[PDB]
Amino acid sequence: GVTLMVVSQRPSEVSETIFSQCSNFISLRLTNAVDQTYVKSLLPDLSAGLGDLLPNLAQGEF
Amino acid sequence: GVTLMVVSQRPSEVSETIFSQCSNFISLRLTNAVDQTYVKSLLPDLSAGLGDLLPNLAQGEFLIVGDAPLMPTVGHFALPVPEPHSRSVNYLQEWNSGWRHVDFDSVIDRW
Amino acid sequence: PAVLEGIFSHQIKSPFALGTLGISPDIKLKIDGDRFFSKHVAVVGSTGSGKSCAVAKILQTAVGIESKANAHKAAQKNSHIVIFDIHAEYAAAFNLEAGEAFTLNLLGVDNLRLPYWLMNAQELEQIFIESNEHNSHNQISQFRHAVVRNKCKHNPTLTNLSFDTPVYFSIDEVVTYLENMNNEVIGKLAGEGKPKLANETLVSDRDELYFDAVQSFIVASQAAATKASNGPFNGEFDRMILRLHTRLADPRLQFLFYPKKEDGEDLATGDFADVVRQFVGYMTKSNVSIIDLSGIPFEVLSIVVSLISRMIFDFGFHYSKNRHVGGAVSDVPILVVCEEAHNYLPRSGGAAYDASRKSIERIAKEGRKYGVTLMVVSQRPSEVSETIFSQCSNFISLRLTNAVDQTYVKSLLPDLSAGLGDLLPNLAQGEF
Amino acid sequence: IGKLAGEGKPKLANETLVSDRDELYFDAVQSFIVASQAAATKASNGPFNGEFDRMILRLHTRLADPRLQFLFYPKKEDGEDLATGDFADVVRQFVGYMTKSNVSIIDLSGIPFEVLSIVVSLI
Amino acid sequence: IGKLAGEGKPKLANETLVSDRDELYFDAVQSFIVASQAAATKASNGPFNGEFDRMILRLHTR
Numbered sequence: 001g002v003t004l005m006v007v008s009q010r011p012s013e014v015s016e017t018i019f020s021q022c023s024n025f026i027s028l029r030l031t032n033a034v035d036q037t038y039v040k041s042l043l044p045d046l047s048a049g050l051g052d053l054l055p056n057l058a059q060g061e062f
Numbered sequence: 063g064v065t066l067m068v069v070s071q072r073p074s075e076v077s078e079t080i081f082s083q084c085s086n087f088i089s090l091r092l093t094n095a096v097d098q099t100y101v102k103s104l105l106p107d108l109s110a111g112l113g114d115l116l117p118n119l120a121q122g123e124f125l126i127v128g129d130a131p132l133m134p135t136v137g138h139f140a141l142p143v144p145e146p147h148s149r150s151v152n153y154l155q156e157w158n159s160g161w162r163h164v165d166f167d168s169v170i171d172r173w
Numbered sequence: 174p175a176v177l178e179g180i181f182s183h184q185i186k187s188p189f190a191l192g193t194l195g196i197s198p199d200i201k202l203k204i205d206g207d208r209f210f211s212k213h214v215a216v217v218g219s220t221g222s223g224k225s226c227a228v229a230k231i232l233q234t235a236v237g238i239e240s241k242a243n244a245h246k247a248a249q250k251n252s253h254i255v256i257f258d259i260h261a262e263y264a265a266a267f268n269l270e271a272g273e274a275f276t277l278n279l280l281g282v283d284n285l286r287l288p289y290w291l292m293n294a295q296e297l298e299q300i301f302i303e304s305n306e307h308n309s310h311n312q313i314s315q316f317r318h319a320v321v322r323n324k325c326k327h328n329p330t331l332t333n334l335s336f337d338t339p340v341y342f343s344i345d346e347v348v349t350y351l352e353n354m355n356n357e358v359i360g361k362l363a364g365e366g367k368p369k370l371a372n373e374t375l376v377s378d379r380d381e382l383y384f385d386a387v388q389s390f391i392v393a394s395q396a397a398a399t400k401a402s403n404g405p406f407n408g409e410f411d412r413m414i415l416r417l418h419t420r421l422a423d424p425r426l427q428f429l430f431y432p433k434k435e436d437g438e439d440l441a442t443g444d445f446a447d448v449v450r451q452f453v454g455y456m457t458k459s460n461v462s463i464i465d466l467s468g469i470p471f472e473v474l475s476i477v478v479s480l481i482s483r484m485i486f487d488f489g490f491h492y493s494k495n496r497h498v499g500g501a502v503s504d505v506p507i508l509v510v511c512e513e514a515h516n517y518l519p520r521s522g523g524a525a526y527d528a529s530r531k532s533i534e535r536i537a538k539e540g541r542k543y544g545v546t547l548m549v550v551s552q553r554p555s556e557v558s559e560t561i562f563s564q565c566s567n568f569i570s571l572r573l574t575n576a577v578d579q580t581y582v583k584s585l586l587p588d589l590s591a592g593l594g595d596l597l598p599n600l601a602q603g604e605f
Numbered sequence: 606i607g608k609l610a611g612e613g614k615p616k617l618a619n620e621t622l623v624s625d626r627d628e629l630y631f632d633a634v635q636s637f638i639v640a641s642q643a644a645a646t647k648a649s650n651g652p653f654n655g656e657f658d659r660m661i662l663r664l665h666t667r668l669a670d671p672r673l674q675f676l677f678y679p680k681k682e683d684g685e686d687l688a689t690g691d692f693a694d695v696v697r698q699f700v701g702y703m704t705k706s707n708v709s710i711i712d713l714s715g716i717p718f719e720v721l722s723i724v725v726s727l728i
Numbered sequence: 729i730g731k732l733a734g735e736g737k738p739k740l741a742n743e744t745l746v747s748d749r750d751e752l753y754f755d756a757v758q759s760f761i762v763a764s765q766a767a768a769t770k771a772s773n774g775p776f777n778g779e780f781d782r783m784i785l786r787l788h789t790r
């Protein structure tokens with residue numbers, strides 16, 4: 001009976017050993033590219049058709 | 063609080079491990095094709111859309127990309143002040159002169 | 174055409190003519206030489222393409238020649254050039270008529286002076302010695318020891334000497350020393366642990382005696398009456414002594430081992446200067462110097478090329494420094510020409526073709542600052558050390574047919590639009 | 606080294622045995638007896654006798670070069686060698702007074718082409 | 729090694745000096761007196777003591 005909830009805006013600095021356990025994921029606009037690469041290296045259901053919206057996202061969308 | 067300002071004119075020989083960490087990018091006239099290819103490969107926004115512009119850039123014109131600006135964009139610099147100089151030799155001039163004399167001994171003294 | 178003229182003639186800083194256009198021969202082509210000569214250059218092509226007959230044109234234009242008519246007869250202007258020729262081809266171009274008064278230095282196997290006491294260790298080990306041996310270590314150690322002893326003796330005033338300090342030292346004396354060591358015999362009596370001579374005398378310092386002449390050691394007999402044993406370095410130097418006796422006996426190397434001056438006397442330390450001004454032209458006041466290598470053996474080419482390039486770089490350095498003390502720069506610029514680079518500048522080789530590379534590599538990098546520039550020539554760039562070609566700025570090319578070279582080149586040249594990489598094989602003879 | 610009873614120590618040309626080198630060798634060079642099979646005065650060669658010549662030569666060579674005095678014989682304004690109590694004055698010729706924004710330039714044309722990467726990594 | 733006078737060698741636990749290693753060691757193992765700092769029994773370790781452990785373990789293992 002215990003959970004977690006991580007937050008960050010510079011994930012490239014965070015440890016992967018932990019992100020390798022979360023099940024559901026959320027995301028908003030990402031401009032830098034290093035992140036984008038790190039991210040796309042992890043997520044389980046990222047079709048290429050979705051890997052392009054990340055920098056094109058408006059204000060308030062997710 | 064430590065950051066870099068890498069410069070070069072022939073990237074394909076540099077360790078990609080580094081170019082894979084810079085956020086903003088700037089470029090100018092780039093004729094060779096291998097470099098165009100490498101660059102294009104690095105960046106999606108710089109797809110065939112604009113990469114076709116590089117070899118036709120004037121002098122004092124640049125192309126910028128990254129998170130800092132508002133959008134991919136082109137620019138035109140102005141001359142800086144004071145300019146940098148190198149103080150090198152001019153063969154063609156020193157040769158239309160006469161013929162010189164030398165004190166070889168003096169030189170050997172240092173040698 | 175008027176436009177083309179107004180462009181290619183009247184919009185440039187330091188006009189240097191090069192020729193004409195491939196379209197309109199009633200037009201000329203001019204460029205900025207201040208950048209063309211002040212940096213490193215490269216030329217390539219294939220056989221029958223017309224390279225040498227273009228290099229020669231360039232140089233003739235540089236020193237101010239046209240139609241076998243020296244324009245600067247009254248005044249010899251400033252220009253300093255050194256050429257590494259092999260096939261002995263360029264002596265004809267500059268061989269003007271006495272009525273034109275174009276002095277020219279010219280060397281190569283019989284009027285050359287380039288002794289053996291100007292080297293470092295590597296070169297000496299390469300010349301005098303091989304390394305197919307177990308006890309090579311102690312042999313070489315004795316060699317170096319004797320060398321240093323001979324230097325110290327012949328030049329006592331100084332200190333801090335090694336196996337590399339360039340100063341007079343004899344060789345026959347070294348050989349004599351080694352022979353006496355290889356015939357040595359030590360006494361083994363009470364108070365006789367020392368070389369025993371035929372006159373039954375004990376030697377104090379080998380270095381004091383050995384170098385003059387040979388001696389007469391007694392039998393190495395453990396008989397108590399004359400208990401003596403053979404020198405610890407006896408009968409272990411045959412191969413080396415033999416190879417040396419051979420080398421020195423060779424008659425194709427008297428320009429090196431026994432380089433006599435015009436007087437007919439042997440060279441010494443006080444002549445280290447005159448050795449140089451010939452490589453430059455300040456002995457006869459000629460703007461040019463040529464080095465013929467055809468009439469030279471097959472083993473010792475790189476050594477020479479390294480020695481020479483080294484002694485040029487050093488002059489440039491020191492003179493520019495003395496001149497800069499005055500708040501200025503060198504007014505004695507220098508140009509060097511290296512042909513058939515694929516021979517003594519291989520892309521990949523053993524130790525044989527090692528030295529040259531360094532002595533040249535250096536120039537490629539630093540020369541531009543001290544007034545020393547290169548000009549490379551070849552037809553097989555794919556066999557040259559990329560390290561060097563990487564450094565040149567302006568390039569020239571002629572007809573190319575092979576493909577491995579087309580590719581290797583296109584990998585480098587900056588302004589190579591795709592529309593031109595296809596011309597090369599379809600180039601005429603005399604077009605560039 | 607000696608090869609007789611009670612002679613399991615390096616032997617000196619003065620016919621003396623060495624106790625410990627960590628105190629002796631750094632002082633200067635020393636003379637050694639001859640390697641003889643004489644049972645009365647016997648001697649042999651150490652394990653590193655005739656194996657360190659080239660390594661020694663390279664150093665005797667480099668140390669002479671004047672183009673490297675800034676690296677082997679650096680001297681202070683007083684004209685003295687550096688010690689372990691000036692580590693900071695070094696750094697400060699790159700940074701120079703945290704406040705009052707500073708600029709630092711380096712010129713590598715003069716340095717040879719064999720130590721460049723080293724210099725860079727150090728800084 | 730005994731740090732005493734004229735004893736710059738190893739000293740057996742039974743207080744005997746070492747002349748030729750190559751004649752003794754191969755035969756079997758040997759025990760030496762302690763490296764006691766006592767001026768009477770002054771002695772330090774060897775130059776190679778406490779380094780050949782895993783390289784000696786692997787062998788008996790194989």
Ligand SMILES: Nc1ncnc2c1ncn2[C@@H]1O[C@H](COP(=O)(O)OP(=O)(O)OP(=O)(O)O)[C@@H](O)[C@H]1O
Nearest residue numbers: 218219220221222223224225226227552602603604
């Ligand atoms: N401007 C020119 N017009 C026509 N022909 C020329 C011109 N210049 C040179 N040639 C011809 O080129 C030939 C000389 O070729 P060259 O010796 O330069 O070849 P190369 O580069 O030395 O080839 P390789 O090194 O393989 O011998 C001459 O026979 C000459 O007829």
Ligand SMILES: [Mg+2]
Nearest residue numbers: 223224225226
């Ligand atoms: Mg030719």
